[PDB]
A paper describes a structure:
The phosphate group of PP is located along the cationic half of the cavity. At the same time, the mannose head of Ac1PIM5 is positioned along the anionic half. Only the first three prenyl units of the polyprenyl chain of PP could be resolved, with the chain pointing towards the hydrophobic groove between TM helices 6 and 9. Y62 forms a hydrogen bond with D58, potentially stabilizing its orientation within the active site. The phosphate group of PP is coordinated by three conserved residues, H322, W319, and K195. K195 forms a salt bridge with the phosphate, while H322 forms a hydrogen bond with one of the phosphate oxygens.
PimE contains twelve TM helices with both the N- and C-termini located on the cytoplasmic side of the membrane. PimE, like many other structurally characterized GT-C enzymes, is an inverting glycosyltransferase, which is thought to operate through a single-step nucleophilic substitution mechanism facilitated by an enzymatic general base catalyst and can occur in either a metal-dependent or independent way.
Numbering used by the authors: 21 to 403
Amino acid sequence: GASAWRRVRAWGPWLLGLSVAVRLAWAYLTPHGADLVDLHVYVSGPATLGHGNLYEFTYPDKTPDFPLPFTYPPFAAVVFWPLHLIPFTLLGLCWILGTIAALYAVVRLSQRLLGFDDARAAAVWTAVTMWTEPVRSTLDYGQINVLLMLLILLAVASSRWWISGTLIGLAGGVKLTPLVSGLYFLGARRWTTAIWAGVVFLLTVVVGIAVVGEQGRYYFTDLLGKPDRIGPIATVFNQSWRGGISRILGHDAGSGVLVLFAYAVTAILAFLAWRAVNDRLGQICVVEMFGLLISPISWTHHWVWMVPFMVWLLHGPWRDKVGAKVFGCGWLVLLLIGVPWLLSFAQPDIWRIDRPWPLAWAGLVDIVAAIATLTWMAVVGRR
């Protein structure tokens, strides 16, 4: 029914408005709705700046069970030192509004990348995907994942080498996970932009050493970005290969042979999927789908890159293939409902790795969905 599709498109602004009102009401009416454990970490990290206790910092106020640390790169603390100058509520409401606006802007950028501009459809997409498990997880925790997605797609949209390079470098300096997006630029043969993005990431490392130095150092040696310190590896929310393999195993294999084989097979699948795509949005979406699978820690709130992927599926060049619609609706039903969020209740505690067949196998849900999408893209491209 394309008529109903047009009717709902016309009802965009007054559906995104409803979604934003509902989200804002929930956050500031329910206890722990505006808890913002990761925004409070970002605010209390730099708040201790200049006192030699920034990475030894722990934040158990909001989750006594698990003390939230400041695992971000020191450049993130440099960037968040201004947040120390803003009252907590004036920053919480600002951050929620910023994440919402970043979601709308990234949807608009995805539409522009696909070759069409549609403010109403962008509002509808923002409202519908606002409640996808990754987006609601980011909003709940205050984690900056929509903002970095916006920065990365802004870099992709801008053909100018310096703009894209600087955006990618700064965004990757704030968090190391989005650095995998740079690989897309390697695939796009944008060698100069990739070089500049790497240079900016190194200059962000230098800034972090300068400002947050003498307290946060050796961030790559003796630490290796160890997944354990960031958080539990086996918890179902950790939807990377490592999380699901640990669930089905009962013990974190980590760099084990069996995890390495999975890493290699997903590497080949993602490379074939990218080889099966030709448009910027699809290429970046495949690259980030692979990044979410290879990173040692990829919580649900990291999987906000799926939203541009669904936009590509339902509007990109493959808006007619039977498989394209099938997998777009599959991703929508999976994320909107959220299997990992539902399964997280079954496990005794976030630190329990042993699982029976149901709670372990169902823990491979998002991994299996991503691998199925990658294999489908590879086979359809090869054919």
